[PDB]
Amino acid sequence: MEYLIGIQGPDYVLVASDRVAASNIVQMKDDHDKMFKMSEKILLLCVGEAGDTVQFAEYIQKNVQLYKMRNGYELSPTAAANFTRRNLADCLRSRTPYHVNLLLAGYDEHEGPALYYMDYLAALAKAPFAAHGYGAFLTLSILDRYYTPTISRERAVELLRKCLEELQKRFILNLPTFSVRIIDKNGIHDLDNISFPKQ
Amino acid sequence: GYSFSLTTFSPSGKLVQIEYALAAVAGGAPSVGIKAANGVVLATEKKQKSILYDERSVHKVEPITKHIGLVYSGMGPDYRVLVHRARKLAQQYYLVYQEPIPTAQLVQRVASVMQEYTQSGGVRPFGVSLLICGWNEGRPYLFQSDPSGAYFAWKATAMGKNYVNGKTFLEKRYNEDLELEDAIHTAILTLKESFEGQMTEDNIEVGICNEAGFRRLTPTEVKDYLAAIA
Amino acid sequence: SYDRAITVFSPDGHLFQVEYAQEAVKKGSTAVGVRGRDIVVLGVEKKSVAKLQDERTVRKICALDDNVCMAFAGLTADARIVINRARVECQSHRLTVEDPVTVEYITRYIASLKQRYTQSNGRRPFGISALIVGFDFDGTPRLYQTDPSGTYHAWKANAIGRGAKSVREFLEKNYTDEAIETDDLTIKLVIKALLEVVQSGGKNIELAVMRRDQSLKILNPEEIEKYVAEIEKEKEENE
Amino acid sequence: RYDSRTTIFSPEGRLYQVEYAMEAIGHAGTCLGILANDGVLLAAERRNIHKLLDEVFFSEKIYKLNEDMACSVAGITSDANVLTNELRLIAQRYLLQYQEPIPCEQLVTALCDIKQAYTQFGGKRPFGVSLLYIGWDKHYGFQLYQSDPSGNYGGWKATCIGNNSAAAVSMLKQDYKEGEMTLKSALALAIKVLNKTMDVSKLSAEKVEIATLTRENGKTVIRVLKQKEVEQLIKKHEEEEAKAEREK
Amino acid sequence: RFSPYVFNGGTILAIAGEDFAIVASDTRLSEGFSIHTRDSPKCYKLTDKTVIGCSGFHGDCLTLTKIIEARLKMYKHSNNKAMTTGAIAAMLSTILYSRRFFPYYVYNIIGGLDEEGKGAVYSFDPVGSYQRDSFKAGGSASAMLQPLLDNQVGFKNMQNVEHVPLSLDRAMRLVKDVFISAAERDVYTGDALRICIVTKEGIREETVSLRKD
Amino acid sequence: YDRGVNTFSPEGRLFQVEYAIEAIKLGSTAIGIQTSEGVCLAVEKRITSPLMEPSSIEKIVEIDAHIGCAMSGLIADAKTLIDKARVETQNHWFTYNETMTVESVTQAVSNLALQFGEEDSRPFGVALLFGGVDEKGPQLFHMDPSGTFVQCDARAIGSASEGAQSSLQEVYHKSMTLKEAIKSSLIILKQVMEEKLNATNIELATVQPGQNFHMFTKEELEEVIKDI
Amino acid sequence: SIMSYNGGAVMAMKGKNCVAIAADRRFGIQAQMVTTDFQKIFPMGDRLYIGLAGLATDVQTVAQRLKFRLNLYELKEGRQIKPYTLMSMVANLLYEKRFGPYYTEPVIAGLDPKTFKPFICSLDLIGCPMVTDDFVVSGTCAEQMYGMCESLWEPNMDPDHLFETISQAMLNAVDRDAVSGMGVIVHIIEKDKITTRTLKARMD
Amino acid sequence: TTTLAFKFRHGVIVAADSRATAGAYIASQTVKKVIEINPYLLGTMAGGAADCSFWERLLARQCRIYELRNKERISVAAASKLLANMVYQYKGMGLSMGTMICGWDKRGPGLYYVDSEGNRISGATFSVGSGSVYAYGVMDRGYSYDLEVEQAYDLARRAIYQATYRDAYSGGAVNLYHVREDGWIRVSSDNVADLHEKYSG
Amino acid sequence: NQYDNDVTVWSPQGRIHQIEYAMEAVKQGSATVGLKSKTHAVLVALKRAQSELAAHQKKILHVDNHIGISIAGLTADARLLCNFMRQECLDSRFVFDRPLPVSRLVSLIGSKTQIPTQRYGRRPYGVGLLIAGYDDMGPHIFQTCPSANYFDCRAMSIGARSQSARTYLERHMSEFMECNLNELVKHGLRALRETLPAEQDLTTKNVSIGIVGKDLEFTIYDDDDVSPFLEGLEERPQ
């Protein structure tokens, strides 16, 4: 339904979710949060069946915390992404399948920043910028029009401003407020909440 | 009165219910096996207790596949059980890989089976030491195992009564480079060294392993060969 | 009636292996632990560096969560298994009700597991006794200890291992009311406990702290030298 | 007196089978690994050096386990096969789950837990086998570890096997090195250790075994080296013995 | 195909009084377009202070009756005392939820006295919810009976009519008239009426016939 | 000999149960007295260290809102039994909307007070006192490790229970009052204890039909102590 | 189809003394692509590759499972694997899910470990092996690659003409294909070395 | 059927109707939907009766066991979490349950929303049922944080009146509960016809 | 004596001493006497206490509307067989919708108790049941044993010093058959008053009497319908 965008930079990962938790007619929650802080430099976003999102939050979040408290150091984004893909692929072929759409944002001391991209059919992907829903389409046109691998973080924020101005113009949906993180050499820094008065 | 049984170590030494199983193995029938340049020859010592017994019923030299010979020195009823295990296991390998199983892999898995039976604590181990050989990938092999689950690789070895004397003779007489026939000759020599002297086409039983495959020889060619071979 | 097995009583009403398994703890390394009012601190003795290897793997003080801290005595393998189980228990509790894990629940888990582990058929009981320190409810400092029987038993200070009676007896003569906080006096209290240790070698001391809000902090063998220097200064001022 | 099983305690509280497993360790092959950066080594003594073998296995104590790790072993030999198959299966499960090589410490603790589960449970024979660890990771580099039948594991830089290696550990402390990562120096040191500690007169190369592990450009290869360099290592060490008798 | 359900019908009435519980029901057991019998009382006396009626699928009514009697004996033979009414209500509710994914297609009414000695009617549903009400009509004749009880017992939709509490004999005349009026129009109703009355002194029964068509 | 739970004696008897009854004796004492006004109950804590926090050691626990308990012997067998009772009470309220009466509580506990079996584990090492108020007024209940449960009017357990029962039968009759039974109990406590009686040694647990909630006395127990 | 959910095309062609394997780069949902760098050719030991086309989840899971059993086999036995051994192993791995099948069409391309003998085979979604001598193809597009490879293959081919032939065949068949496109990776291996090239394809 | 709940400065307002029909046939008019979990927890009945009753009774059981094991009153998020983890074990098997969880917390007020679809969220205002959108309209007209007590009472009373006025599946007595910091309290149980006479003019 | 340890081991004389030790464990229970008329079966037991303040341990416990049992021996096995007994009652009450014949019930008890007397791992049950019931052929008084050789009688008594009770049954088994309930019950306690030493008297609080009749449901009594049964007695002939 909604979509949370995940731009890769040179040394940062620009993720941006929504704050909407509507139920088939009405907007129940207008300050929702879908951001799941796994560890000090690894994030996770989730869109799918809203009974399964909390379950993935529990399972993946807490088991990565379990690895951290066990061994003594933080995971790579790649191993965590593969752990998630393995768990979705295993829980797919059961009497209880899982239907969400994930995308992974991490940061290594060696590999630097990292973006991953899931599916409800449990596929790994190493993308520059991802898509889900219908904001998928409406972001991907402009975002593939104006991408440069050597882009600065302020140009990325400006690009997100511009794309959101295009999102508020031709949807059926409402989508009032978008929350935004950023990952650096330090960790997870929350930027300001990005809302728009329309007219 | 200790060890007793299979769950504890000794105060300082080793496992008594493995050492006694090896003792019962050493109290078994003599046998010899020699790895030559082109083949490996196995041969046993099979005397019937009376003149009543038949020599076309029970067979010591036993193939596991068409290219793998295997003999023992010990107790037949356990020998058959572990052989049947090796048969089924080699067939499982041929199910999975569609390829004849290598003798090292057989020794790995048969050794794992025997070591599993030495695991504590309700069954006894085998009273069976094996001699596994075959011509896999040109170079033939010769693998001796034991009831403890371990294994070796020999040029020539023996198992049974007076195996130390047969081993000193195989150290003396045998060497690295012979033919299949010369290995047959020195194998019958080291078998006749420690057996009783009344040795016919029936008291011994010989299987060879060509590069053309395993071959279990007949009393016809045995009496053709062993009719005063030296 | 005999030292075997764990299942039958004595004729005068005892369990031999319950009483005997505490002796493995009682012959074990010494590790103390006190609570401040705001900062809780503990440490083990007998680092025993044998000159040719690393010692970052032999660390006897760890954590299950960011809010709880560990110690033990007795043999190390049972401590390894119990802590590795307790991490997963803490994380399963976190997968349930979303609170930071209370020290009381995880001590009930560990002692309960240890006891129902003991009651079973021929399982050798874990000859350890853990020290479980945390400050969760508005930073209320708590530390409980365990037992090979599996009895959690809440204290204010603690001392186990070799010669634990004397080391606890020092805290009887040390622990007045106005200990903390006064964090510096809690620091000097840990330092006086380490000076009152059975060997007090000065370099074999390893201590770790928690200010009830921060993380676990491993100190440095120069700050502790200053602490021993000012403790000897206090001993000279007593003269 | 209070013998019978592994479980439960003898009243001290001490143990029966851990001590007797170490006394089972002591009468076995001697191995060692050395302090080295940019590489690490293993040494081993050939048991059963009788002339009628084949040596077509290339490896009798060494087991190149995952890609970048080998392990020496000592003790009851079939239990070593039992543990090594399972340990390869553990490492390969980790690689299946994460697509990352195993960083060796959780591997070591997993095998220690496998041994420890047979220490507590009853009535089972605990593994009377100690074994070594060499390997490389992304977090510490070249590493050395000592497994024990108790389930305790020691991170060493110069390791210890039983009664045939207590004098080896004494020579390793009295001739301790630090700072030199040159592998040939540590190989000469190991040659000296096996020259004194083994009772082999003049150190025949058929009674020895040496395996090394170096880091090459992305690969972390394991070198089970052959016999001729061992021969010239013997000649080098005996030339050093001539250098030692220069003081006469 | 095989269907697991069939509609037997039935009509169950209950009235909570000042100190009494009246439960009455017809005894017709029918199926489709035929009559199996003209004598099958849906009412059952559990204790001295508890009467249950069960309509709907007849086999589940019988089975549920037997299981309820079993658990009554279990509670008494464990705890040396009989149940109250609401305890039986909670127990029946737990059973009906215990077969959630294959339900009993059975309407249920428990009437009886509380510990204060007053009437208490617990209605039910085929899935297992319940509540303490004064009067319910269960079965196919539910809608034919509920608004009249709203008229008389509840005095609803009336002006300047004060609240007199319901006596016993007036309630008896009410039950006779409502079953005659419903038997005139329902097809799952007639030929008899089994009226059970719970007092503080025991259980009274009374059989009033009806028209025979 | 006698070596195990699966072997009788030539005269009786277990000979494991006997050693459990012997293992009652090691514990600290506790005294409860049934009075129709309500059940009073007492215990000794036997504090070792000043570091030993006194309110942390549990002796009176709360099973139901009107049901107390007291333990005597191994702590953790008692904790298991308290856990099971806490489960089972709630199930009884669940399936019946009412309070499980205390005799039925004790039948439920004594169902597997002896279900000891290692094949097809050991018997438990604690005796328990149950105090509560059912419909028939207050109830005071005394069980054992052997599951032989009976009602007692004023039972004493544990160490020095002999002279406790002696001086108890010396002072008891049927028509006692509340505070008189309280002071009569704590007299026997300070006769059987070794330490000076103060606010940290003992604790009381009083349940009344009109005062069902809070089966405990906190630091008014100081005032009850100073009246002797 | 279910095979046409993520697209896919894998071509292998046997040369004279060498063998070449190529695949597409596009990954995405039914009409919406995602990325251009999806790996479908995986190295399994030295001088022995495998190609996978079909559902990408089964592709990655089957590749990791085969890597698992492959490493266990090559560490139980120090020699490297022969290609027929790989073919029987893959057929066994597929046939274990007889009624729960993965959705893929594996293609194995490798050389002889002792000689330079080339080898091609391809399998079905239940484990039916098939060895040929000219070429094997898999994926969503089939008939295009069949027509092109039956049009342009010769029996004895120098590696340059083998490379250019598989290049033109893949480029034309992918340009006729709709759901699979967006660049081509080419692996040409031989006894001496391993060559990997990427072609300038139509990105439409 | 229509419930709502909204929290403010002085605790939480909980109100609902009491009509529970059987299709086009009204079963009752006096179904007490707001299930009393504890002296400190209150759940509602939203769509399907047996699921709401059973699983909230099981939640009350588990809360009592938690309190007796930890000597400590349970938090609200804890209850919503346990309820969602219990209900999620029958996903797809056809349970209808859309209740709300209210209670006072160490963090203060507590308001969560648990579905049989497992849509565990917090928030400030909620309304469940068929005629819930009517209540959303009139409440989000009348919502603030700084309301008074009688203001919130008349607000929720107006809200349930509007919801039962327009929808046909809603009616009966209007219950009205109020959560405080110490404990909840029933405010009133008002019939619709009295409210129509009172508010109509 | 090394063979007198376990149930499985046959003796070299063939006598399982575990069974006889279970018998001697049964003999340390309370006194109880069961006896029937043609129409009424009455079993009467004796209570004991731990102390003076303590209550008396009950012996006669309810089972079913036409079945009630006495007991002597262990209490855990008693309630275990009680649960099994009630289960066997209500199972056939559920299936067949009839009350059970008593004989097949006690055969079920014997088959239940056979397996803990033959295999290893469970001790034989120390048990003292006296079972009174009503099938279609009237009252039955059965007795049990730990050897599962259940006996049918007309009048038995088990427990400590029950031999004087047995001799009383010998000298009044001709007289039991014709009388009505009242003097039958006072015959029962004129066995129980000889199950005691003569320097004390059978009181109220120590006795319980259970009557089940061919038209009368099984009912236990304690001091209150028993004070009517305790009158109508003479002293012992001192």
Swiss-Prot record, chain A:
The keyword Acetylation applies. Induction: Up-regulated in ovarian cancer cell lines. PROSITE patterns: PROTEASOME_BETA_1, PROTEASOME_BETA_2. SUPFAM superfamilies: N-terminal nucleophile aminohydrolases (Ntn hydrolases). Coiled coil: none annotated. InterPro entries: Ntn_hydrolases_N (IPR029055), Proteasome_beta2 (IPR035206), Proteasome_bsu_CS (IPR016050), Proteasome_sua/b (IPR001353), Proteasome_suB-type (IPR023333). Its main location: cytoplasm. Belongs to the peptidase T1B family. This is Proteasome subunit beta type-2. The gene is PSMB2.
From Swiss-Prot, chain C:
The modification N6-acetyllysine is found at K226. SUPFAM superfamilies: N-terminal nucleophile aminohydrolases (Ntn hydrolases). SMART domains: Proteasome_A_N. Glycans are attached at S129. Phosphorylation by ABL1 or ABL2 leads to an inhibition of proteasomal activity and cell cycle transition blocks. Its main location: cytoplasm. PROSITE patterns: PROTEASOME_ALPHA_1, PROTEASOME_ALPHA_2. Induction: Down-regulated by the ribozyme Rz3'X. Up-regulated in colorectal cancer tissues. One of its GO terms (cellular component) is nucleoplasm. It comes from the Eukaryota. Keywords: Acetylation, Cytoplasm, Glycoprotein, Host-virus interaction, Nucleus, Phosphoprotein, Proteasome. GO terms for biological process: proteasome-mediated ubiquitin-dependent protein catabolic process. InterPro entries: Ntn_hydrolases_N (IPR029055), Proteasome_alpha (IPR050115), Proteasome_alpha-type (IPR023332), Proteasome_asu_N (IPR000426), Proteasome_sua/b (IPR001353). GO terms for molecular function: identical protein binding. It is found in: Cytoplasm; Nucleus. Gene3D superfamilies: Glutamine Phosphoribosylpyrophosphate, subunit 1, domain 1. Component of the 20S core proteasome complex involved in the proteolytic degradation of most intracellular proteins. This complex plays numerous essential roles within the cell by associating with different regulatory particles. Associated with two 19S regulatory particles, forms the 26S proteasome and thus participates in the ATP-dependent degradation of ubiquitinated proteins. This is Proteasome subunit alpha type-7. The gene is PSMA7.
Swiss-Prot record, chain F:
One of its GO terms (cellular component) is cytosol. Its main location: cytoplasm. Glycans are attached at S185. Induction: Up-regulated in colon cancer cell lines. Up-regulated in fetal Down syndrome (DS) brain (at protein level). May be the target of the transcriptional activator NFE2L2. Keywords: Acetylation, Cytoplasm, Glycoprotein, Nucleus, Phosphoprotein, Proteasome. Expressed in fetal brain (at protein level). The 26S proteasome consists of a 20S proteasome core and two 19S regulatory subunits. The 20S proteasome core is a barrel-shaped complex made of 28 subunits that are arranged in four stacked rings. The two outer rings are each formed by seven alpha subunits, and the two inner rings are formed by seven beta subunits. The proteolytic activity is exerted by three beta-subunits PSMB5, PSMB6 and PSMB7. PSMA5 interacts directly with the PSMG1-PSMG2 heterodimer which promotes 20S proteasome assembly. One of its GO terms (biological process) is proteasome-mediated ubiquitin-dependent protein catabolic process. Belongs to the peptidase T1A family. InterPro entries: Ntn_hydrolases_N (IPR029055), Proteasome_alpha (IPR050115), Proteasome_alpha-type (IPR023332), Proteasome_alpha_type_5 (IPR033812), Proteasome_asu_N (IPR000426), Proteasome_sua/b (IPR001353). It comes from the Eukaryota. The modification Phosphothreonine is found at T48. This is Proteasome subunit alpha type-5. The gene is PSMA5. It is found in: Cytoplasm; Nucleus. The modification Phosphoserine is found at S9, S49, S56.
UniProtKB/Swiss-Prot annotation, chain G:
The keyword Chloroplast does not apply. Keywords: Acetylation, Cytoplasm, Host-virus interaction, Nucleus, Proteasome. Disulfide bonds: none annotated. It holds the Pfam family Proteasome. It is found in: Cytoplasm; Nucleus. InterPro entries: Ntn_hydrolases_N, Proteasome_beta_3, Proteasome_bsu_CS, Proteasome_sua/b, Proteasome_suB-type. Induction: Up-regulated in asthenozoospermic sperm. The modification N6-acetyllysine is found at K76. It comes from the Eukaryota. The keyword Glycoprotein does not apply. GO terms for cellular component: cytoplasm; cytosol; extracellular exosome; nucleoplasm; nucleus; proteasome complex; proteasome core complex; proteasome core complex, beta-subunit complex. The modification N-acetylserine is found at S1. One of its GO terms (biological process) is proteasome-mediated ubiquitin-dependent protein catabolic process. The 26S proteasome consists of a 20S proteasome core and two 19S regulatory subunits. The 20S proteasome core is a barrel-shaped complex made of 28 subunits that are arranged in four stacked rings. The two outer rings are each formed by seven alpha subunits, and the two inner rings are formed by seven beta subunits. The proteolytic activity is exerted by three beta-subunits PSMB5, PSMB6 and PSMB7. (Microbial infection) Interacts with HIV-1 TAT protein. Belongs to the peptidase T1B family. This is Proteasome subunit beta type-3. It comes from Homo sapiens.
